[PDB]
Amino acid sequence: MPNLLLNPDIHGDRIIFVCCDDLWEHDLKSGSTRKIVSNLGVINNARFFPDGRKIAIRVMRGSSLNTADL
Amino acid sequence: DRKTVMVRKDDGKIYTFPLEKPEDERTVETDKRPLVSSIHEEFLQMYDEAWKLARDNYWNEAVAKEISERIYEKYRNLVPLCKTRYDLSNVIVEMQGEYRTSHSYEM
Amino acid sequence: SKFAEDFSPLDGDLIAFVSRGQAFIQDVSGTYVLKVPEPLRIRYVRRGGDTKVAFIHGTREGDFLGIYDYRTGKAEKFEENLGNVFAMGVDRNGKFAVVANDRFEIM
Amino acid sequence: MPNLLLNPDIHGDRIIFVCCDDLWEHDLKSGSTRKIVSNLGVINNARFFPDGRKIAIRVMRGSSLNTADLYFYNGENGEIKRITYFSGKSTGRRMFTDVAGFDPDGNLIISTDAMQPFSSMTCLYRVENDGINFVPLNLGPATHILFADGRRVIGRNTFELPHWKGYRGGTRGKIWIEVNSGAFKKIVDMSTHVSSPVIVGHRIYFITDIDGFGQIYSTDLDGKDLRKHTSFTDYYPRHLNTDGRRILFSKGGSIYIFNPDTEKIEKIEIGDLESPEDRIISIPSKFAEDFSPLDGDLIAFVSRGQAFIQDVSGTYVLKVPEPLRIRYVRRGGDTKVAFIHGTREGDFLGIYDYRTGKAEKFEENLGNVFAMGVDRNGKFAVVANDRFEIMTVDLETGKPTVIERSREAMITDFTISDNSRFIAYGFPLKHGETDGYVMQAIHVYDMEGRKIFAATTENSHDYAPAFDADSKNLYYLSYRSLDPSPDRVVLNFSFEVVSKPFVIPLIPGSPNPTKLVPRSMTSEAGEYDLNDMYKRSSPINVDPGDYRMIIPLESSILIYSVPVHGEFAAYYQGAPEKGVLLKYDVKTRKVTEVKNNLTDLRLSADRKTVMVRKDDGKIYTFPLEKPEDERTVETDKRPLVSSIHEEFLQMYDEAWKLARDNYWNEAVAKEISERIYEKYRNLVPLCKTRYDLSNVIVEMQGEYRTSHSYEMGGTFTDKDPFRSGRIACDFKLDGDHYVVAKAYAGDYSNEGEKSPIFEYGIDPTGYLIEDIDGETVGAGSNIYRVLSEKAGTSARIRLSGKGGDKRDLMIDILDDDRFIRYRSWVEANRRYVHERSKGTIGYIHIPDMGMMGLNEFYRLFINESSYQGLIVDVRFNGGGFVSQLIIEKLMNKRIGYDNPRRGTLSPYPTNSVRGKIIAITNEYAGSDGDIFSFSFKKLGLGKLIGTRTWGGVVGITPKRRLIDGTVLTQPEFAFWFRDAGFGVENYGVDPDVEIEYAPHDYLSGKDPQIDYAIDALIEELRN
Amino acid sequence: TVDLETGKPTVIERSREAMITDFTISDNSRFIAYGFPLKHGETDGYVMQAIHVYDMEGRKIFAATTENSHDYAPAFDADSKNLYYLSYRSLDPSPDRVVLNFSFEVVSKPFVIPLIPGSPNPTKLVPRSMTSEAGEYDLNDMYKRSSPINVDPGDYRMIIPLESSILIYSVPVHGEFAAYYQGAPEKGVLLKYDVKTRKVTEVKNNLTDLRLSA
Amino acid sequence: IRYRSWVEANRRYVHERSKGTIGYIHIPDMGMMGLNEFYRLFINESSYQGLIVDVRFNGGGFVSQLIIEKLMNKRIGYDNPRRGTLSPYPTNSVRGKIIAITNEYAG
């Protein structure tokens, strides 16, 4: 069985998205996917900066995800 | 037998004391044995209930019968793709939105 | 403890309770714990005899009354649909049970 | 900055390795790296299956990584799954329960001691159905298993030994190989340690430092044609692994590739991979220590190198403004506090004022401080160091002044009179240079006159000195009230309750106040005179016992008492000693209990505030006047804030400094330390996790090329330890039902020595296990996982024996069953020896030389000592320090008997072996294990049978921890044998008759060592 | 056993090491438990003691405990369904405060043996509804069903089983000087163990001897 | 008091006359007192070049074997600490030569 992917962002051929609450990156060219950040809590939004280098991330914490920070 | 008393105090713990001698209360412990379950079976269970509640409690009984039966299968097929609680939430909320009405929350 | 509910006192200074859809028969200490042998969603558990306990098993179709004996092991499960049960009790003589549902019925 | 990579494995162009405790994969072709598995805990080993698809992984859990288990990763669907629920015990140097290798059919073969009596018994098992069933290979303990041309290659103790470079002891790595299609032959047994074996073509590649440094070697399937392939000099290479074509390994934090055909080595370029948040949060209580009461009902304490001034509530907390390592904090004034700041150079005294903010920090080096106090008037402080000195540091100038220096131990037990004129302290001393015991005498230093006076004589142990408010008497304790207490099992006696309080009036002619001598009938008013004061000593009428502290008050005396107890939990589990606060009314002479369940106590300056630690581990504070009103000290309100890299640099420097300052040979230290410091310090910044830092520290400890350089404790993960459900049984998957293959039991009448099932009056052996807690187990349900999930409680278990024998019991699911397995094993060997020797030989086994060894030795000695012969089996003996006590008993020669009118003969001595004794020992007996083996030979008590022992005999007694709680050990006590010097170190003891225990011996199910012992003794029992 | 009517004695068993002075009779007068001194070898240095149980019916002796230490102070419960006793088997060394030495000071612990196989250790508090007793007497291989009672080790001289508590005579560790010369009596105390609360308390102190009625 | 004074007196005498090369110990009997007096000095006199084990007037008892056991121990090693003095192995081992004194009052 596959996963549930969501909330993506693009920058050229690179595509970051959320899977299993963690942040992943996929290369349109090579076709390879990898988890770039995890164990931070529940990530629902990731945004590529202009230079496509850094990434602003939103993560939720607390049993019911009542709190969040960047 | 009106002899045993089981209570819950403000500290959240459960206690039990004989009605005759309320001085001798004991603390109920339940975290000795772990709780064992399967994510996918629970998720399927939870989905079906969320879906059943949405239909059984919608203000308009008529519309429910049609709305429920029309969205059930579509969203149930995504449950197995859910590995985390948040995933399941994404599926459940989308199916709640199907009632095109306010106050369909998840807390 | 995190998902526990419906804590209730049984015969022989025993405890029954529900958590995450599962049900258990344990001593206050939580050292001797028995899991009721029944699929997901056991809404309620109620003292029904020296070693017998009645319970409400929930499914997608509705709620049903079930009985279990933590001594012999037997655990029949009726088919008569009761609707959505929200309250359940058993007489002291263990012959019948009183149930309330979302249909506003008492039976 | 880059990361610290390690423990790789290869499969074609794909290379998996460990980084930041997680598992990563790198493609040689594309050059891309990615984390394939994380948040499982600490991963130290990952092994590619044959098809290169699945991956067997070893992960450690529990704060100190005391537990481990195995997981399967499938790169096809990203599936992760736990395979073992053994909860194998592991330590830094014995990371047992790991992957051993793969059989020809592509099945995983693991190595674990989970179902064995001894940890060293890492037996081989074939994993089946993802962990449903385990089939034993009965090849004996093994670390690696390789297959060449249908032949079985076996690696014994072939894991890396970073902590001990140049190891040449009996437990060194060795490789055996199959030849007779069922027989094995030892083929690689060099003088030094051999590790990480692999096969490429028809050669076995491995690592060893036979030449003074770690290099890769290889030989043919005969251990012949030795070749050296590498010439590294920077760091030791480790973790060899291969795919059949190329060899992979790590070194100095980088991964390299070795091509056997080209003999060329290259470094893989991976670059930066992960750099987690540096600023971290910690729970002050977890690393707290040195809790102390200040003025105005305030509290001071130290945690993780930091110091704080807070109210009991922990609501108003002040952090002392000082860099890393604040060893101690002490009340120095209304709002001032003195502290000991530690650095790489040493420890220094510092003062701080939590009101004004000022915080000067002296430069005068005090050495390594271990005790620190301040006078009540806040002018000077008394300090003790590892140089055995006691001194007074001026709180104004900073200038230290040594009062006296001991040549035996530290002067940490001292006190200052309230008028700041006298300083009393325990002074360790010895009558002779080679004396067996260290005495202690109280000394009193007079600030005026600056002369030291003797408070007590030097014939025993006097301690816990204390002055009274008026400064007119000096009270103290001593173990001088000798009275023997009888041993309930063995003919023996010891001094259990011989502690008694004494007092010494500082003014001659003044009587002992507790004596209640009418004032009108005495003529004091004299003047101070400390001369010949040990002659005026007087006891205080309080029954003997075991007192640790004496506090004189107006009309009563407070005494801290510790009831006699066993030492087992304290020696292993580290359990704290339980004491109680007693009160002695001078008037009524009656004694009462003021507080119990104490494990530590501290008194304020004004003698009014009491701060204690109870058995629950919490700190409390109550006024001495009304002990009924105690409050709980909370410190976890405010988080602990620190920087990983700054702490890591701090921790490294300390580990390095301790290793040098405590090495037994001072000379060698200066050279070794300065030579390895920089090299390993440059890797610290590559460490992002605790485990990383550990890898660096351990490697630098190995640089001392000596035994006993360990690392225990510390926080490596926030993951809870793996759990395992045990009922002392062996399960065998037969068909679709699990059957009870074996039911362990030793002495049925003892405690905790049999499967909990036995209590229901039936032997589970042969029975079938239907279900557990209503859930069915068998071909589909993993019984281990189930059991693991019930560990610590009683679950209903449906059993089925022969016929219609149906059982339904509430069995206790144990968290561990090692001891039961052990006792079962001993009782088994006992029976065997009795039967084979036709009832003429006894058997005893000493698991170690600590409290357990004492237990096990006497447990049987009392019943086996009177046979014609005796086998003292010390195999797997983990050491300790009671070997001399054991030799002493075996040394006793029976020279007489007692003839009773009625009854049987009674031998003299009672603790005398009746006949001939033979000792069995293997490569798993070390330290005091080595000592015992060597001594048994030297004293000629009998013949020594087995295999050369471990070879590590440089004692260790740690006395300092790392800010994270880590407890490092340093070989500080070099054992010197007469006519052998330190020769035993890094070598072990050779048995008179060598008897290997080859892999085929295990296949046959015969113990060649115990058998030789029996037979040999039978022959000696013909005369 | 001497017949109180006829006067005829009947020897049950004979030890070859010491006297069999530590015994008790079940309330239903069917069983006789006692400490039996024994030695593995003729020239053995230590004398072990195993509890034996003689059955008036069948007239056969059964082994209550193994013979590897010292088991004593046997005692039956009112219903005559369990046999409680003490033993110095809980080995744990206590450190000598003066000389490098260790000895067994507090290694005494209580144990029980259910006379009906399958019946669990009562002090364990195993729910009746979760057990299936009602079995019949069977003293064979009873030393295998032995079970400890969760009471901290020490130096116990007597164990008295009651309805919902156990009385235990404890003797605190002390010096032997006065006892060896002056002949001073040993100081003990009567402890109570509540089976339910598992809590221990002091019923009486300053004792030097104790006897219980029928 | 008279007894201990006598022992300490002989102790001083032996130290002085042997120029500090011989230790002294005296066993009043072989019971509890003997155990006390023997270890009371053994711990400080055992490490001299020589040792005098005086057993004159020894009234007996039953712990002789325990005493012989200690005197039997042969010193075959030492412990070298980075800081501190040597520690003999065994600890309870006499360092050198031992001589026993006895009279007609030991039985």
Ligand SMILES: N=C(N)NCCC[C@H](NC(=O)C(=O)[C@@H](CC1CCCCC1)NC(=O)OCc1ccccc1)C(=O)N[C@@H](CCC(=O)O)C(=O)N[C@@H](CC1CCCCC1)C(=O)O
């Ligand atoms: N106090 C404690 N709670 N623990 C201390 C026990 C540590 C121990 N070592 C040994 O038995 C040594 O033989 C010794 C021997 C010597 C040598 C010279 C002087 C004095 C003692 N003893 C020792 O280290 O300790 C005490 C000591 C120290 C200074 C002065 C006087 C006594 C030892 O750990 N041994 C190895 C032996 C391995 C082998 O036999 O090959 C071991 O790894 N044992 C366990 C793991 C443990 C267990 C407990 C602690 C640490 C590590 C194993 O995996 O088998």
